[PDB]
Amino acid sequence: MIPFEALIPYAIMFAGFCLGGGVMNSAITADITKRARGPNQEIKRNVGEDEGPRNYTKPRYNTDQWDKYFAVRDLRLTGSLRGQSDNAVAEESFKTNSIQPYSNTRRPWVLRRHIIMKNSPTKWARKYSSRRDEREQEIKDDYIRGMGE
Amino acid sequence: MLQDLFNNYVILVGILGLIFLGVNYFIVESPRMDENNGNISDYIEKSGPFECGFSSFNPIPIAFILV
Amino acid sequence: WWEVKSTYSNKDIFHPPQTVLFGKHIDRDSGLMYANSRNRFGPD
Amino acid sequence: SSTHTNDSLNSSNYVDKLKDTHFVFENDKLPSEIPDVEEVGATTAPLLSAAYFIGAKCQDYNDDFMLCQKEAKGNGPIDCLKEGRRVTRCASGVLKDLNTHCSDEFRLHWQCLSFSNLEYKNCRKAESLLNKCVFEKMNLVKKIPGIPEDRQIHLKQNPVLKPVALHQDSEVAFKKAQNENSI
Amino acid sequence: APLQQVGRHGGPNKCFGEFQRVVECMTNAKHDSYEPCNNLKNDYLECRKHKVERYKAFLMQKHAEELGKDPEEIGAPFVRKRRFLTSKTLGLVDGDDYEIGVEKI
Amino acid sequence: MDLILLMLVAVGLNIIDIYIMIEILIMGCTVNTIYSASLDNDMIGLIYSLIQIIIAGVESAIGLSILVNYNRIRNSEEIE
Amino acid sequence: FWPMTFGLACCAVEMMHVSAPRYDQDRLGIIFRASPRQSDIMIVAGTVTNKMAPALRQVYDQMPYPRW
Amino acid sequence: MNLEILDLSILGFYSLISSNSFESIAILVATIMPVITELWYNYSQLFALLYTLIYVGAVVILFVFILSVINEKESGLFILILVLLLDDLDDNESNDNDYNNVYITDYADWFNNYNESDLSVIGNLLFTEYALLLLIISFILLMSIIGLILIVKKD
Amino acid sequence: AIGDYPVYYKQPIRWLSYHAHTRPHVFYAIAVAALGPVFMMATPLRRKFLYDDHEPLPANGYPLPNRSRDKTLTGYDD
Amino acid sequence: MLNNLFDFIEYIEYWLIIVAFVASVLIVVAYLTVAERKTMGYMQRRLGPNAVGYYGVLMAVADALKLLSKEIVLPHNGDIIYVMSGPLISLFSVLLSWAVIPFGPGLSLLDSEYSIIYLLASGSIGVFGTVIVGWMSNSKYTVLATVRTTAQLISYELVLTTVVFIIALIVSSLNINVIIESQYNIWYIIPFFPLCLIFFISALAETARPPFDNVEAESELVSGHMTELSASPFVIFFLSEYCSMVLMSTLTAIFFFGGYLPFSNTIHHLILNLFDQHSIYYFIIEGILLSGYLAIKANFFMFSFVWIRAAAPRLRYDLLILFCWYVLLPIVFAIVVFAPGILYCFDALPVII
Numbered sequence A: 001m002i003p004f005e006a007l008i009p010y011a012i013m014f015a016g017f018c019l020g021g022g023v024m025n026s027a028i029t030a031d032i033t034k035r036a037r038g039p040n041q042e043i044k045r046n047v048g049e050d051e052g053p054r055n056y057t058k059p060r061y062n063t064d065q066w067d068k069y070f071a072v073r074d075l076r077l078t079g080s081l082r083g084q085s086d087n088a089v090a091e092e093s094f095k096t097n098s099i100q101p102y103s104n105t106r107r108p109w110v111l112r113r114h115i116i117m118k119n120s121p122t123k124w125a126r127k128y129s130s131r132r133d134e135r136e137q138e139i140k141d142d143y144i145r146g147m148g149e
Numbered sequence B: 001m002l003q004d005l006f007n008n009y010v011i012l013v014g015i016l017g018l019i020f021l022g023v024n025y026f027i028v029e030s031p032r033m034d035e036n037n038g039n040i041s042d043y044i045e046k047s048g049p050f051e052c053g054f055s056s057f058n059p060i061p062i063a064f065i066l067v
Numbered sequence C: 001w002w003e004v005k006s007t008y009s010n011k012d013i014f015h016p017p018q019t020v021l022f023g024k025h026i027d028r029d030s031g032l033m034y035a036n037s038r039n040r041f042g043p044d
Numbered sequence D: 001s002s003t004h005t006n007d008s009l010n011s012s013n014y015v016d017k018l019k020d021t022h023f024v025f026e027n028d029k030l031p032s033e034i035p036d037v038e039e040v041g042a043t044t045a046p047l048l049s050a051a052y053f054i055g056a057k058c059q060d061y062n063d064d065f066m067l068c069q070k071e072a073k074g075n076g077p078i079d080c081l082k083e084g085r086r087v088t089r090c091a092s093g094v095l096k097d098l099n100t101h102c103s104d105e106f107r108l109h110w111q112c113l114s115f116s117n118l119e120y121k122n123c124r125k126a127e128s129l130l131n132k133c134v135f136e137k138m139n140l141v142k143k144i145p146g147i148p149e150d151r152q153i154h155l156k157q158n159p160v161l162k163p164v165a166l167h168q169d170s171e172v173a174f175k176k177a178q179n180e181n182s183i
Numbered sequence E: 001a002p003l004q005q006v007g008r009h010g011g012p013n014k015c016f017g018e019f020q021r022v023v024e025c026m027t028n029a030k031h032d033s034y035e036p037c038n039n040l041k042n043d044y045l046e047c048r049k050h051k052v053e054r055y056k057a058f059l060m061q062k063h064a065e066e067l068g069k070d071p072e073e074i075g076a077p078f079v080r081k082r083r084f085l086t087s088k089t090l091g092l093v094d095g096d097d098y099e100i101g102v103e104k105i
Numbered sequence F: 001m002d003l004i005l006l007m008l009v010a011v012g013l014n015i016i017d018i019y020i021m022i023e024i025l026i027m028g029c030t031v032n033t034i035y036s037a038s039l040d041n042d043m044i045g046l047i048y049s050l051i052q053i054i055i056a057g058v059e060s061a062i063g064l065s066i067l068v069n070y071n072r073i074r075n076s077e078e079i080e
Numbered sequence G: 001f002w003p004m005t006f007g008l009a010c011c012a013v014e015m016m017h018v019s020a021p022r023y024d025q026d027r028l029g030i031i032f033r034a035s036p037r038q039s040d041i042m043i044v045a046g047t048v049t050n051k052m053a054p055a056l057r058q059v060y061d062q063m064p065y066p067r068w
Numbered sequence H: 001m002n003l004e005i006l007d008l009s010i011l012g013f014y015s016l017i018s019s020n021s022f023e024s025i026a027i028l029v030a031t032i033m034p035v036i037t038e039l040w041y042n043y044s045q046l047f048a049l050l051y052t053l054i055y056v057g058a059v060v061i062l063f064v065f066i067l068s069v070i071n072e073k074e075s076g077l078f079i080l081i082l083v084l085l086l087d088d089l090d091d092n093e094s095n096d097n098d099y100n101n102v103y104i105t106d107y108a109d110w111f112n113n114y115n116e117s118d119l120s121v122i123g124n125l126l127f128t129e130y131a132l133l134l135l136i137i138s139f140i141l142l143m144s145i146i147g148l149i150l151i152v153k154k155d
Numbered sequence I: 001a002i003g004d005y006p007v008y009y010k011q012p013i014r015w016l017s018y019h020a021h022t023r024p025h026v027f028y029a030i031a032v033a034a035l036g037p038v039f040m041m042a043t044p045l046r047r048k049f050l051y052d053d054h055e056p057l058p059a060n061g062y063p064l065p066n067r068s069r070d071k072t073l074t075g076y077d078d
Numbered sequence J: 001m002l003n004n005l006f007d008f009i010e011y012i013e014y015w016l017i018i019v020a021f022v023a024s025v026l027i028v029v030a031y032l033t034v035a036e037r038k039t040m041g042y043m044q045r046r047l048g049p050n051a052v053g054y055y056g057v058l059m060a061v062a063d064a065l066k067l068l069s070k071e072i073v074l075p076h077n078g079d080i081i082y083v084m085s086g087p088l089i090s091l092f093s094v095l096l097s098w099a100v101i102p103f104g105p106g107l108s109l110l111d112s113e114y115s116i117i118y119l120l121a122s123g124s125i126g127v128f129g130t131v132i133v134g135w136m137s138n139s140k141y142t143v144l145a146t147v148r149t150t151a152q153l154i155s156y157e158l159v160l161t162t163v164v165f166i167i168a169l170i171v172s173s174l175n176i177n178v179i180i181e182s183q184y185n186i187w188y189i190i191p192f193f194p195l196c197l198i199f200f201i202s203a204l205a206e207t208a209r210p211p212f213d214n215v216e217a218e219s220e221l222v223s224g225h226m227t228e229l230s231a232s233p234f235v236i237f238f239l240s241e242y243c244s245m246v247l248m249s250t251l252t253a254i255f256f257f258g259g260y261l262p263f264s265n266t267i268h269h270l271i272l273n274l275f276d277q278h279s280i281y282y283f284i285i286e287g288i289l290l291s292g293y294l295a296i297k298a299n300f301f302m303f304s305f306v307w308i309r310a311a312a313p314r315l316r317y318d319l320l321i322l323f324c325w326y327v328l329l330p331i332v333f334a335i336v337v338f339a340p341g342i343l344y345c346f347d348a349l350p351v352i353i
């Protein structure tokens, strides 16, 4: 004698997983596909009359460092991180849009602002002793001191 | 691997924390509305421990410590 | 008297420079959903 | 591997804010002393689809391009610029061929890769058609060095790990070839 | 001898080549002293921190200030927000300036 | 500012507060190593950091064990 | 409707039988709670002696409003 | 608005005023969290998670475990803000100005076709190259198990 | 000895039985754990009877041919 | 307008996905509480809640709204820090631990090769949240459930951590998605059945569910830490215990029952052939299916959380700490030296493809 009233909450919990999964599978796939249609918004939205059936792109997982180099390389070709293109020759804009990110190399904020973490025998000498910095500054000075030869 | 979708999730959960606290503070009826006998502060009878009714006032085993 | 050379004493190993002088901030006048990107090649 | 670096795009815009990353362009093209080459325009999926045919056709130049890097002794980028254009031209030759000989067989395969997380294990039905077509019209074959011919993975009739979801265009195109070709 | 400066992928990293050339010179048998290897030692330190090269960037920043050279016309164009690496900026033929998708790959 | 030894004002007046300051102090050493190792793309620095985290854990356990037995030694009448 | 398990004497036996399978107070959303903090209904089921009286007042005062 | 500064100023404010051991253990958790979060972004996501798994999950809840055992018993606003402001002014940990004002990049390359996580390389070297370091560690762990029991066990 | 605790060096067989009855939480944890290293020792048996080890992976960078650069290499020129 | 409104959606689309994700979890958690009483009601010949909303559908709504509108009891009026902080840590940790669970291939908010570490690290923050609740209280019952709470969670954390690492050792990957896909040909319940019993036993202790109930034991320590909790601090802490139940039931599905993989590849193939892959209707059906397989597997374990509660008397605490150390841990270390041995013997050491 199967109680259906007892299984009502489970059919609602089953719908809870399906609701979240159904949205994620379709929304992310649609967004990835749409941005992989062309380099402007008047191309992404509209579908041409002479365009064929639409081939959706599923989201990508388990990537490595080559997929970060492939993603930027695809960005410079199509305007999307997961664009599609198989032209044997790239655009002439491909040779003048390489993105090289420049970022600072300063120590973490906690390492140099914490009331306790910043106190140390060697961190004071880096911060309050000129012995190290005067020695290294000699090498920088002697770079421009050797351009005469 | 992009994680801007993950960041929005963490931010939303952070916002969800403020909502849970304050929704109680804005929906409970005013102390005057119910019985007016006092706030939680002055009503020290209500703001106290539970000792099953009778008012009263850790040398734990070393085995628990070694666990 | 200034010379244009790499800061590396050795010469037979290629050491491409890893610094740059920042110029235009292209996305400076941007908004939301739509960058007002400035002209990269030359002035506005 | 999703480790943060100073050389490409990172995980989130909060990494960029901490590092104060500037994405810097350089408008300057190459000087005229270096003869120009036409860069390959294929994206990730087409390259992974045609990777073994670039290996079959540009094997001599790829080996020679690398041997120039080994024997340049640290001056590799500057002393292998001429040998690095043969590889770019050779690889452009293969992608141009696939577009003019096997356009639909090629596109079907790398649409499958773009549909199945860019994994070769999920696209064997489309891949088998492409390999069979390429062989008859360009003589290129796919070979995985270091193993016997009988034990190559892409020829495995009953693989242990199979795709969870089927590519409709692959299954439809496959059974059509089961009539067009398996006479 | 123990491996030092191993990259995040198991191979030699950026500055391993310089360090190896130092070890070859220091442990060499045809050297009477360590003077010939003094330049190689600087290169290994240079490869890691770029202190001399950062200094050169400081003068070129400071020299342009004393001459009035406009930073935007001597420097290189850059973008601070990754969402605004738009196809207009990348130079694509019919590219919009609408932001790009950096949510999920 | 810290040359006047300000960090002494920031450490509480219990033996357990000293133990925490030792951990926060060592935490700075490990964070410094992780910083250098990632910039250099050197995994040997990350091996060092992994050892420092593991060794800094063993130091905590021994210190707490001494502190725990120190506490029960006073409360050792146990004549009930 | 979460009451507080304040059964004192034979009246509490009938209180437990309300929660038994035949009547099943839980089917109406009634869960007996063992603490004033989590309870809003006090059910006095049994004899209130003089010795128990001050404890009953203390337990009553510890219930957050609204209470019945 | 590098908000990581404001988290530590609050943290640096409560470290000067903590009285009991409840707040002292709070300074520990309030310090790891900026350490973990500033490692998750920027430098190393692997060691942000190792810190959570090993510090918070293992050594932090041991502190609160023994605080409940040990005991629970028992300044001026001008001087604190004056000290915190004075502490706030000079925050340059190093005095190489060019090293702190000039940005750098790296160039990627495709020579590494066997891409694997850092924890793959660390295990590759710890279990092969420095197997002595790994084996001494299990020896240090072994001494602690003996060391804990001899210190604490009564009989 | 109807119930005496066995001595290991005189009664090896009965010593394990005592521990396989009174300490099932120790005897079978040791029995399971030893089955790993035991199986490692039988690896050479599998090599001669079942199948050889696979070929090692190409995880050392690009495979560089062991020769000198080709001199007659032409085509795809500027 | 129609062109300046579409881009508005495309600028808000990835916030609607997250809300649909959060709503997806909360619906399961909200109706898990009903399903616990509805199921345990029918095993006791009762009926369980069937009077609050048609057939009791609005039972979680009433309980949550009743407590959200109770008077919060603070020791002094401005002591909201002490009451809330405990549950808040517990709720955030288990809500952040949902960020790595995939509902399909790649459909997880956070995807990184350190997902397994992130999942174990997040859970250990919640453990810190639990013990803090009592440790800021003078009530004897509430402060009782800290030293016993601390060790119970501490002791069964080693067992839960090691089991996860054995599965990660069989696939040589700390990524959640890779583990699920590695189970295509076989589900890890067949080779590692003992680990599943050990995983499920450990999972009960970590959420403090019966028969490992000694923390919040009504007959022993009343509500445990919650005997001083009322109104919102009670719900947030109660919600955390049921987010963990849903999570740890989903984790057993992922590690031993294949995650989102189908029960039958044929039935999966036949169903999807009725939809065209060139229309978005195909991908909704697949997402509903793939989450459906996970939901059915996860539901079976949320059922078993309740099922074991209705069949096993509570286990004594002193005999509970000695169980994980003197029985479970030797077995778990025995296997961790057993699985590498079998794999090496047959030249089957795993690699992340």
Ligand SMILES: CCCCCCCCCCCCCCCCCC(=O)OC[C@H](COP(=O)(O)OCCN)OC(=O)CCCCCCCCCCCCCCCCC
Pocket (backbone or CB within 6 Å): B017, H007, H008, H010, H011, H014, H018, H022, H023, H025, H026, H027, H029, H030, H031, H033, H034, J081, J082, J085, J088, J089, J136
């Ligand atoms: C999701 C938010 C979770 C945190 C909620 C609480 C936020 C309130 C601010 C405290 C946290 C700031 C971080 C610095 C620690 C400061 C701890 C302290 O000094 O005591 C704070 C608290 C209230 O007491 P108070 O009046 O402020 O001080 C005098 C009391 N004799 O004294 C108490 O111990 C009361 C109980 C508080 C227990 C908090 C446990 C420590 C915090 C860990 C969780 C947050 C982790 C840190 C994240 C932010 C880091 C900057």
